[PDB]
């Protein structure tokens, strides 16, 4: 169990543009593209080819790699995130990276209270706090797996 496998599970794999739980055009392994033609356009530019709304597994895997790298890099460059990340064990690092991949750096950075509790190693409590969020109510099952990972420090939720 690693971040890649962890996210592959949470995001799935879809080779044709599609909308995500939020209405946004997305593709591959949770690769957020955006409206429609505009998204087919975003997609062709991202792949550098005329896609016709569809890509290979290999290209979806390329996006994925780019995406995970971008997230870790974004955490590390972020003032409020970095310190949290550094303070965590390797499993929980995975958990933060998941959230960032999903919701953007910016969005994670607003989980101010949870971020501080994670820092203080207040597990039970951060879990409770993370749950009061729109995030959890919109995608409760994913959210619970990620929250379990932060609570336990194990990969039990993904097995
Ligand atoms: Cl891209
Ligand atoms: Cl879900």
From Swiss-Prot:
This is Endolysin. The keyword Methyltransferase does not apply. It is found in: Host cytoplasm. The gene is E. It is an enzyme of class 3 (hydrolase). GO terms for cellular component: host cell cytoplasm. Belongs to the glycosyl hydrolase 24 family. One of its GO terms (molecular function) is lysozyme activity. It comes from Enterobacteria phage T4. The active site is at 11 (proton donor/acceptor), 20 (proton donor/acceptor).
């Amino acid at each position: 169990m690693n971040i890649f496998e962890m996210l592959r599970i949470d995001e799935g794999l879809r080779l044709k543009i599609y909308k995500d739980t939020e209405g946004y055009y997305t593709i591959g392994i949770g690769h957020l593209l955006t409206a429609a033609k505009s998204a087919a356009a975003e997609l062709d530019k991202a792949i550098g080819r005329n896609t016709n709304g569809v890509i290979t597994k290999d290209e979806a895997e390329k996006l994925f790699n780019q995406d995970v790298d971008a997230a870790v890099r974004g955490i590390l460059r972020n003032a409020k995130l970095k310190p949290v990340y550094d303070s965590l064990d390797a499993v929980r690092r995975a958990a933060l990276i998941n959230m960032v991949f999903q919701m953007g750096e910016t969005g994670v950075a607003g989980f101010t209270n949870s971020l501080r509790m994670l820092q203080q190693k207040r597990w039970d409590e951060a879990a409770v706090n993370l749950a009061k969020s729109r995030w959890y109510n919109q995608t409760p099952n994913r959210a619970k797996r990620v929250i379990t990972t932060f609570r336990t420090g194990t990969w039990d939720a993904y097995k």
